Design a protein around this motif. Structure first.
Motif, mmCIF file in Angstrom:
data_model
loop_
_atom_site.group_PDB
_atom_site.id
_atom_site.type_symbol
_atom_site.label_atom_id
_atom_site.label_comp_id
_atom_site.label_asym_id
_atom_site.label_seq_id
_atom_site.Cartn_x
_atom_site.Cartn_y
_atom_site.Cartn_z
ATOM 1 N N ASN A 15 0.901 -1.235 -0.153
ATOM 2 C CA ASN A 15 0.003 -0.046 -0.145
ATOM 3 C C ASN A 15 0.960 1.206 0.103
ATOM 4 O O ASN A 15 2.068 1.427 0.552
ATOM 5 C CB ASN A 15 -0.894 0.068 1.324
ATOM 6 N N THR A 16 0.201 2.348 -0.603
ATOM 7 C CA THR A 16 1.093 3.326 -0.987
ATOM 8 C C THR A 16 0.358 4.782 -0.601
ATOM 9 O O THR A 16 -0.254 5.560 -1.402
ATOM 10 C CB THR A 16 1.151 3.429 -2.376
ATOM 11 N N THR A 17 0.877 5.166 0.526
ATOM 12 C CA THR A 17 0.440 6.728 1.047
ATOM 13 C C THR A 17 1.645 7.102 1.889
ATOM 14 O O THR A 17 1.542 6.993 3.204
ATOM 15 C CB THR A 17 -0.841 7.102 1.561
HETATM 16 C C1 LIG Z 1 -4.013 0.660 -0.607
HETATM 17 O O1 LIG Z 1 -5.001 -0.367 -1.170
HETATM 18 C C2 LIG Z 1 -6.234 0.303 -1.051
HETATM 19 C C3 LIG Z 1 -7.104 -1.033 -1.860
HETATM 20 O O2 LIG Z 1 -6.984 -2.222 -0.838
HETATM 21 C C4 LIG Z 1 -6.472 1.444 -1.804
HETATM 22 O O3 LIG Z 1 -7.697 1.892 -1.345
HETATM 23 C C5 LIG Z 1 -8.488 2.483 -2.610
HETATM 24 O O4 LIG Z 1 -8.429 3.957 -2.514
HETATM 25 C C6 LIG Z 1 -9.158 4.731 -3.371
HETATM 26 C C7 LIG Z 1 -9.106 6.160 -3.124
HETATM 27 O O5 LIG Z 1 -9.665 6.427 -1.795
HETATM 28 C C8 LIG Z 1 -10.636 4.124 -3.331
HETATM 29 O O6 LIG Z 1 -11.527 4.996 -4.114
HETATM 30 C C9 LIG Z 1 -12.555 5.791 -3.362
HETATM 31 O O7 LIG Z 1 -12.325 5.557 -2.172
HETATM 32 C C10 LIG Z 1 -13.245 6.307 -1.385
HETATM 33 C C11 LIG Z 1 -13.281 6.089 0.065
HETATM 34 O O8 LIG Z 1 -14.170 6.848 0.617
HETATM 35 C C12 LIG Z 1 -14.495 5.785 -1.878
HETATM 36 O O9 LIG Z 1 -15.835 6.642 -1.202
HETATM 37 C C13 LIG Z 1 -14.907 5.825 -3.389
HETATM 38 O O10 LIG Z 1 -16.263 5.209 -3.690
HETATM 39 C C14 LIG Z 1 -13.845 5.093 -4.065
HETATM 40 O O11 LIG Z 1 -13.905 3.792 -3.850
HETATM 41 C C15 LIG Z 1 -10.840 2.539 -3.736
HETATM 42 O O12 LIG Z 1 -12.225 2.279 -3.500
HETATM 43 C C16 LIG Z 1 -9.956 2.013 -2.765
HETATM 44 N N1 LIG Z 1 -9.878 0.594 -3.093
HETATM 45 C C17 LIG Z 1 -10.756 -0.358 -3.242
HETATM 46 C C18 LIG Z 1 -11.067 -1.191 -2.340
HETATM 47 O O13 LIG Z 1 -11.609 -0.131 -4.477
HETATM 48 C C19 LIG Z 1 -5.397 2.306 -1.493
HETATM 49 O O14 LIG Z 1 -5.322 3.517 -2.595
HETATM 50 C C20 LIG Z 1 -3.901 1.964 -1.787
HETATM 51 N N2 LIG Z 1 -2.931 2.765 -1.039
HETATM 52 C C21 LIG Z 1 -2.872 4.090 -1.808
HETATM 53 C C22 LIG Z 1 -3.463 5.141 -1.194
HETATM 54 O O15 LIG Z 1 -2.319 4.171 -2.760
#
Ligand SMILES: *[C@@H]1O[C@H](CO)[C@@H](O[C@@H]2O[C@H](CO)[C@@H](O[C@@H]3O[C@H](CO)[C@@H](O)[C@H](O)[C@@H]3O)[C@H](O)[C@H]2NC(C)=O)[C@H](O)[C@H]1NC(C)=O
Ligand SMILES: CC(=O)N[C@@H]1[C@@H](O)[C@H](O)[C@@H](CO)O[C@H]1O
Lengths: 49, 49, 49
Positions: free
Chosen positions: C16-18
């Motif tokens: 994971n990436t932040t």
């Molecule tokens: C680390 O991995 C996770 C997935 O397990 C990544 O999470 C992903 O993040 C994006 C951006 O937030 C999500 O898109 C949107 O998120 C919001 C959160 O409130 C949601 O309301 C929107 O409908 C939309 O889903 C994405 O959904 C989410 N992954 C999944 C399960 O779809 C995360 O980006 C990774 N680390 C990073 C920040 O690079």
């Protein structure tokens, strides 16, 4: 003469231990009805892993 | 010669087996290193009389 | 998040990436020890990481 001579020696009596030190290998290949036996040091330089 | 005998009352030569094991282990080993401590080992074994 | 070896030793994995620019990674079956008792350590052992 069948196939070849082979050998299968165990590393336990050699005590393959940490401060059991490096090994060297050298073979006494004796010849029949000539007696001019050869010796060879091949593969000898062991590999301290 | 290394004589060894385990007799239940010291007057009863019993049968069984025994092994005398002797090993140059170290002068002032610390044993935090975790490697095996035995330098040498010369194991002898013999069934009891 | 642990994993295990495939047939060929291999393993594939997202992470994971932040975070900030610099990232430095590693993986083990053993665990890290920086635990020598004395600076000589003629006694020594290593496992690749
Ligand atoms: C680390 O991995 C996770 C997935 O397990 C990544 O999470 C992903 O993040 C994006 C951006 O937030 C999500 O898109 C949107 O998120 C919001 C959160 O409130 C949601 O309301 C929107 O409908 C939309 O889903 C994405 O959904 C989410 N992954 C999944 C399960 O779809 C995360 O980006 C990774 N680390 C990073 C920040 O690079
Ligand atoms: C005991 C010994 O010599 N080690 C191996 C043995 O496990 C294996 O079965 C054999 C097959 O050729 O090759 C050798």
């Amino acid at each position: 003469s069948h196939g070849c001579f082979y050998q299968q020696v165990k590393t336990k009596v050699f005590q393959l231990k940490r401060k059991e030190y490096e090994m060297k290998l050298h073979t006494e290949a004796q010849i029949q009805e000539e007696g001019t036996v050869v010796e060879l040091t091949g593969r000898q330089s062991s590999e301290i892993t | 010669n290394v004589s060894v005998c385990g007799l239940y009352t010291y007057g009863k030569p019993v049968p069984g087996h025994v092994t005398v094991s002797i090993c140059r282990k170290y002068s002032d080993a610390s044993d935090c290193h975790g490697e095996d401590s035995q330098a040498f080992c010369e194991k002898f074994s013999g069934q009891l009389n | 998040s642990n994993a295990t070896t495939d047939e060929h030793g291999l393993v594939q994995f997202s992470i994971n990436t932040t975070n900030v620019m610099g990232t430095s990674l590693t993986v083990r079956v053993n665990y890290k020890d920086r635990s020598p008792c004395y600076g000589y350590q003629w006694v020594s052992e290593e496992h690749e990481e």
